From a paper:
To explore the effect of substituting the Ile residue in loop 2 to Gly, we first introduced the mutation into cyO2, which is considered a prototypical bracelet cyclotide and is one of the most studied. Remarkably, the point mutation of Ile to a smaller residue led to a significant improvement in folding yield from negligible amounts for cyO2 to over 50% for the mutant cyO2. We found that when the loop 2 Ile is mutated to Gly, bracelet cyclotides could be folded with high yield, albeit with loss of activity. All [[name]] mutants did not bind the model membrane at peptide concentrations up to 128 µM, except [[name]]hD, which showed an 18-fold weaker affinity to membranes compared to its parent peptide. The negative effect of the [[name]] bracelet cyclotide mutation on lipid binding was expected, as the mutation reduces surface hydrophobicity, a previously reported determinant of membrane binding. [I11L] mutants exhibited similar or slightly higher cytotoxicity compared to their parent cyclotides, whereas the [[name]] mutants had substantially reduced or no activity, which correlates well with their membrane binding. Having determined the crystal structures of wild-type cyO2 and hyen D, we were interested in definitively showing their Ile-11 to Gly and Leu mutants have native-like structures to support our earlier NMR chemical shift analysis. Their structures were solved using racemic or quasi-racemic crystallography. Like the case of cyO2 mutants, [I11L]hD and [[name]]hD structures only exhibited minor differences in the mainchain and sidechain conformations, confirming both Leu and Gly substitutions are well tolerated by the bracelet fold.
Author numbering: 1 to 30
Amino acid sequence: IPCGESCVWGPCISSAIGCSCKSKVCYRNG
């Protein structure tokens, strides 16, 4: 599930809420 953050140049600030960079945007479990 996309969270609402891009990660093309820098990692997900939303890692705090469980989101990780996949395919240039931040996702939690798809």
